[PDB]
């Protein structure tokens, strides 16, 4: 029964929509300024900052030197005549709270909040690869493929925890193991008893990501440590590096900016009755009739801006550039050749040279967003003996399966997880780059609502979005 959850998601999107319309009225924005994605980012950020009860509770008692805690704000980009003018606006957090509740039938409706947070995620992942956090946390800058949802707060519920990657969970746990190595934070203090439950929970999510037995059991051996040290540190890093080949199940949900949902609701679309699903065709559909602008710096390429926002809308930040180009019809260029910077406009840029342009968020085909991490297919699990212990003194060779035994000694370690390491390594030795996953799955035409006819593409350039 998909109509129930489809109707719930639809009600969420309608909440965000009516909310964004009401907000566009509160500011009194033109039809163009309301479709500018920058102002949409400012609005969404204001809503997430207003409902940020942990941040507000930690900012009331200890205020940031910037501004009073009761008020949140952000730059709104307005255009009179032809000139762009950026104005800094401030609104009470309680006011934005009230407007959000009124737009969602009076409920808190945190689901839409987490939706906008995941949208912020996909945009941030598609915009910046955080090499600084990876080198400071002790990880490889070449592991950004696993860094989905790094900007997400741990406050995001199961909906936000599902979209995170293996590397994000590894990093988040590594901050906890590395924090407890300086002082006794795992101590018997109430902070320690609660932090142990946080740690075990995050270990369970990381265990849920992996789809091979060895990885899961290794995570189980990491969680057994009452006081994790450098050993569990290097263990979690080992798991993360294993997630490059033996990948984990990471959810991908197509989350759009609030101006798209708002323009759809303003046009009369009722998402409760019609239904909506992030993994279905609907987002693609909504993007084909979507009219969204974006501010553009002087020498930037508006097509590259459109590609950046497009990748942000389908979580394809770490996808194969070939298959993304096949979905969109136009070439999806890697980040190194993108003649653009972040969609966000800096606080020091002058609006005298700033312009705007239409965003080409359309795609030729469409495809089902997946939760899987591909085909991992290995479990020899032989229980047969492999060496001979001789009893009689007879001239013969003493047989043994040399490949298996000798392969059991590579990657050994003087810790409880040693075995698993070996197995993981062994499993990673069986996988090759050309191992095809998603057998039979293809792309579909936009007029194909029910995925009746797939299109399996044949590929000849580079596949990595980052260098």
């Amino acid at each position: 029964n998909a109509t129930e959850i489809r109707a719930s998601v639809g009600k969420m999107i309608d909440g965000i929509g009516r909310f964004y319309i009401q907000m566009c009225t509160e500011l009194k924005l033109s039809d163009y300024e309301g479709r500018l994605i920058q102002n949409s980012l400012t609005i969404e950020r204001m809503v997430l900052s207003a409902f940020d009860e942990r941040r507000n509770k930690y900012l009331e008692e200890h205020p940031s030197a910037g501004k009073d805690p009761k008020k949140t704000g952000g730059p709104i980009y307005r255009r009179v005549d032809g000139k762009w003018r950026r104005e800094l606006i401030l609104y009470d957090k309680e006011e934005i709270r009230r407007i959000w509740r009124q737009a969602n039938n009076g409920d808190d409706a945190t689901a839409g909040l987490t939706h906008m947070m995941i949208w912020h995620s996909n945009l941030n992942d598609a915009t910046y690869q955080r090499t600084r956090a990876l080198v400071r946390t002790g990880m490889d800058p070449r592991m950004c493929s696993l860094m989905q949802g790094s900007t997400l707060p741990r406050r995001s519920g199961a909906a936000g925890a599902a979209v995170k990657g293996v590397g994000t969970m590894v990093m988040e746990l590594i901050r906890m193991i590395k924090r407890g190595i300086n002082d006794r934070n795992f101590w018997r203090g109430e902070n320690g008893r609660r932090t142990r439950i946080a740690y075990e929970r995050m270990c369970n999510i990381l265990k849920g990501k992996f789809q091979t037995a060895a990885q899961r059991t290794m995570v189980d051996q990491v969680r057994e440590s009452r006081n994790p040290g450098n050993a569990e540190f290097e263990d979690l890093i080992f798991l993360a590096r294993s997630a490059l080949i033996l990948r984990g199940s990471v959810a991908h949900k197509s989350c759009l900016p609030a101006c798209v949902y708002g323009s759809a609701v303003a046009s009369g679309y009722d998402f409760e009755r019609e239904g909506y699903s992030l993994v279905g065709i609907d987002p693609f559909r909504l993007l084909q009739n979507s009219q969204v602008y974006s501010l553009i710096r002087p020498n930037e390429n508006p097509a590259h801006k459109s590609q950046l926002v497009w990748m942000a809308c389908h979580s394809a930040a770490f996808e194969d550039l070939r298959v993304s180009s096949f979905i969109r019809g136009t070439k999806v260029v890697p980040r190194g050749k993108l003649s653009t910077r972040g969609v966000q406009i800096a606080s020091n840029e002058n609006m005298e040279t700033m312009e705007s342009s239409t965003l080409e968020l359309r795609s030729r085909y469409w495809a089902i967003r997946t939760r899987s991490g591909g085909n991992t297919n290995q479990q020899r699990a032989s229980s047969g003996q492999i060496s001979i212990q001789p009893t009689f003194s007879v001239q013969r060779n003493l047989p043994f399966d040399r490949p298996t035994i000798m392969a059991a000694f590579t990657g050994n370690t003087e810790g409880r997880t040693s075995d698993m390491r070996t197995e993981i390594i062994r499993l990673m030795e069986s996988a090759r780059p050309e191992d095809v996953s998603f057998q039979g799955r293809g792309v579909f035409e936009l007029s194909d609502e029910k995925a009746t006819s797939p299109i399996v593409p044949s590929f000849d350039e580079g596949s990595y979005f980052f260098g």
Epitope: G82, Y293, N301, A303, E355, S356, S357
Partner: nanobody, 122 residues
Framework: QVQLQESGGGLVQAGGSLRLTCALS????????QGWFRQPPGKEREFVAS????????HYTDSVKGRFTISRDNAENTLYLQMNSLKTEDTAVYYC????????????????WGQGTQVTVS
């Protein structure tokens, strides 16, 4: 519902001059900017000129600097492209573009187009 009708093209000789005219729809008459692109034979569509409205500034490509001058008519909604010192390199198909917010070289930033008018400079 094509939004821009362009005319004035034809056949001239090197060193001559021509004047391309682009009729502008009511949507297009009041827009952020409008420009001119050219498509040489067998080549991709390249930029020629761009005229902004609120202020009068213009942008030109290096090949036509000085020779070309993109102007606009007052009391009428018509775009003009003055083409002097015409050369064989100028042989192309000239499209009229207009953008709701972009005044720039890239073709991508312009949201309405015409159907060309031939300029052959033999």
């Amino acid at each position: 519902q094509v939004q821009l009708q362009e005319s004035g093209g034809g056949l001239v000789q090197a060193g001559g001059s021509l004047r391309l005219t682009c009729a502008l729809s009511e949507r297009t008459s009041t827009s952020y900017a409008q420009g001119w692109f050219r498509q040489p034979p067998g080549k991709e569509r390249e930029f020629v000129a761009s005229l902004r409205t609120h202020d009068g500034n213009t942008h030109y490509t290096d090949s036509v600097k000085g020779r070309f001058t993109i102007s606009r008519d007052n009391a009428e909604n018509t775009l003009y492209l003055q083409m002097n010192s015409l050369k064989t390199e100028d042989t192309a198909v000239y499209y009229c573009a207009a953008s709701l917010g972009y005044s720039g070289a890239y073709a991508s930033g312009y949201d309405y187009w015409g159907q060309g008018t031939q300029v052959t400079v033999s």
